[PDB]
Amino acid sequence: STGSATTTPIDSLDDAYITPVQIGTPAQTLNLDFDTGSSDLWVFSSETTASEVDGQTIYTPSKSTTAKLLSGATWSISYGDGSSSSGDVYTDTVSVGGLTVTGQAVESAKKVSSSFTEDSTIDGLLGLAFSTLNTVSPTQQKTFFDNAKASLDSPVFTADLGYHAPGTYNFGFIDTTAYTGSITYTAVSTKQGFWEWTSTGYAVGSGTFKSTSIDGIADTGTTLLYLPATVVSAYWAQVSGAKSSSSVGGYVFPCSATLPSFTFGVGSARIVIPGDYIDFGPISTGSSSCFGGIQSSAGIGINIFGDVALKAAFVVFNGATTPTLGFASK
Ligand SMILES: c1cc2c(cc1[C@H]1CCCN1)OCCO2
Ligand SMILES: c1cc2c(cc1[C@H]1CCCN1)OCCO2
Numbered sequence: 180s181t182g183s184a185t186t187t188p189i190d191s192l193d194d195a196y197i198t199p200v201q202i203g204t205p206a207q208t209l210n211l212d213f214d215t216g217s218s219d220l221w222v223f224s225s226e227t228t229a230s231e232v233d234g235q236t237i238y239t240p241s242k243s244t245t246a247k248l249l250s251g252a253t254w255s256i257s258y259g260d261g262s263s264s265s266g267d268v269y270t271d272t273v274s275v276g277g278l279t280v281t282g283q284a285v286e287s288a289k290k291v292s293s294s295f296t297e298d299s300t301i302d303g304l305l306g307l308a309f310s311t312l313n314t315v316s317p318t319q320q321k322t323f324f325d326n327a328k329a330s331l332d333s334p335v336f337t338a339d340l341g342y343h344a345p346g347t348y349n350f351g352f353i354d355t356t357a358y359t360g361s362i363t364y365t366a367v368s369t370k371q372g373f374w375e376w377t378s379t380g381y382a383v384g385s386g387t388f389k390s391t392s393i394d395g396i397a398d399t400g401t402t403l404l405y406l407p408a409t410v411v412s413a414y415w416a417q418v419s420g421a422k423s424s425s426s427v428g429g430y431v432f433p434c435s436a437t438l439p440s441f442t443f444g445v446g447s448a449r450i451v452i453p454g455d456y457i458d459f460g461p462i463s464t465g466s467s468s469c470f471g472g473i474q475s476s477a478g479i480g481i482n483i484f485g486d487v488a489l490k491a492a493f494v495v496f497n498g499a500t501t502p503t504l505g506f507a508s509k
Contacts, residue, residue, distance in 0.1 A: 180330045181351035182278025186213065186340065189300040192459055193486060194402055196340060197301060198348055201241030201274040202285055209236050209302035213348055214400030215338070215374055215496065216483075218312035218322050219256050220273070221286035222303035223295075232292050234299030240287065246271045254286045254314045257480060259401070264291040268315055275305075278350050280327050284313075284320035304400070307336065307496065311379035312372035323353060324350070324498060334498045338399055339434070339509065340490035342456055358493035363448035367502045371481075376494060376504050378484075379446060381406075383414050384439030388449070395482030397496070397504055398464060403459070404441070404452070404484040405476035412474050414441055421471070427462050430471040434461060441473060443488060445506040452491040483509055 186198040197210040202222070209222055216285065225231060225239040246269045255265035266289035273283040288303070295301070306313070312319045314354035329332045331351030339357050340346040347357070368375045373396040382388040411430065415421040417439050419434035432438070438454030457472035472487040495505030 180278055180328070181349070182276035182327075183347060183349045184272075184276030185345050187227065187345045188341065188343065188349050189298070191343070193341075193490065195301065195345060196346070196399070197485070198305070200270070200305060202238055203240070203271045204245040205243075206274070207236075208236055209238060210300065211303050212301050212307040212400060213305045213307055213338075214398070215307040216396060216398035216400045217258065218306040218308045218310055218372065219254060219286050219314055220284065220303070220323055221254065221256070221288055221303045221500050223291070224266070224287040225290045226266060228290055230360065231296045233296050234254075234393075236302045238285065238287065238303075240269045240271065243271055244284075245281075249284065249318075250317075252284075252315050252318060252320075254316070256314045260294070262292045262294045264288045264295060266290065268320070275323065275350065276348070277454075278327055278333070280323055283323055283326055284315060286315065307399070308374065309369050309372045311369070324435030324496075327351075328498055336496050336498070338489060338494045338496065340399070340486055342453075342490055346490070350409055353495060358471065358509045360508055361446045362493070362495055362503040362505040362507040364495070364497070365445050365501045367504055368381075369502060373481075374502070374504055379444030381410055381444065382442040382449075383417050384454075386417075388442065388444070390444075393443075393482055395476075397484050397494060399486060399489060400474075402487065403485050404448060404457075404473045404487040405479055405485065406473065408475045408477045408483065409472055411475045414439070415471065423475075427468070427470070430473040431468045432465045432471055434469040436469070443484070448487070448506065450472045450492045450506055450508060452488060456487055456491060
């Protein structure tokens with residue numbers, strides 16, 4: 180089997196991407212944030228504290244003939260941006276782009292933190308990291324990908340995120356028309372539950388490539404590119420007037436700037452992030468100070484190849500017995 184679904188930026192800055200997902204019988208379609216940095220499929224629901232719902236579409240298990248309470252199971256998750264959610268669990272039929280899993284754990288939110296409430300466009304998350312990170316207790320549950328894997332034509336999914344445009348998540352096949360050149364594959368460590376790999380280095384604009392190992396994760400659920408302070412300083416030093424602002428919470432730059440590109444290494448291959456991808460716009464409405472899309476990972480404890488990096492590439496998440504990651508230009 181295979182599946183193919185379009186993923187769409189939630190706003191004009193590509194702050195996140197949402198993908199329609201069918202849950203239950205008859206189908207209830209929710210727009211979920213596909214997140215290769217976590218492993219819980221959770222949704223706003225009829226059980227979510229009413230004051231914490233503001234415009235989201237909710238899953239109502241009582242209206243699904245295939246929903247079953249997973250008795251005794253609870254979940255609770257805290258993310259690296261300080262947000263969180265928790266609740267109980269149902270199993271139900273879940274379909275993405277024509278690919279169906281029966282008996283998928285659908286984690287129903289009873290509580291969500293303020294940033295979830297405040298984002299009306301995201302109805303929940305669909306985790307695509309390794310199932311070892313799943314938070315359901317006392318019986319850990321499998322991700323949608325893990326459940327689908329054996330049925331897929333090939334045990335893979337691909338992320339093809341757009342810049343200011345829709346893109347695609349495919350399950351079970353590699354669309355050879357969706358990228359240029361060849362796909363370069365690189366080793367993955369699953370020891371922390373993430374799609375963790377080692378970049379071979381970087382360049383800033385038209386500068387020389389610096390060969391250096393940068394361990395990090397491929398995370399579709401993080402918006403920005405978080406790298407070591409040395410690398411980030413070298414980037415922003417090429418932008419007149421750029422500086423790190425403790426009050427704003429990262430590097431800012433004059434909105435009048437033209438940003439240089441940023442290249443990262445994948446083995447002997449190179450992925451180029453255009454300068455425009457690194458512009459996240461005014462820090463507040465009407466400000467001439469703009470927020471940067473490359474930020475320091477110092478304090479976070481891990482480097483993160485988030486959407487800013489991934490959207491410059493066609494990315495293969497290879498879930499074979501020994502997982503790997505593939506990157507191609509596009
Ligand atoms: C977003 C942004 C982050 C982050 C974690 C996240 C979570 C929120 C839900 C999906 N991803 O960790 C620190 C870097 O920024
Ligand atoms: C834009 C502008 C900002 C900002 C964050 C953003 C984007 C980056 C990813 C999600 N929101 O924080 C600091 C103020 O300006």
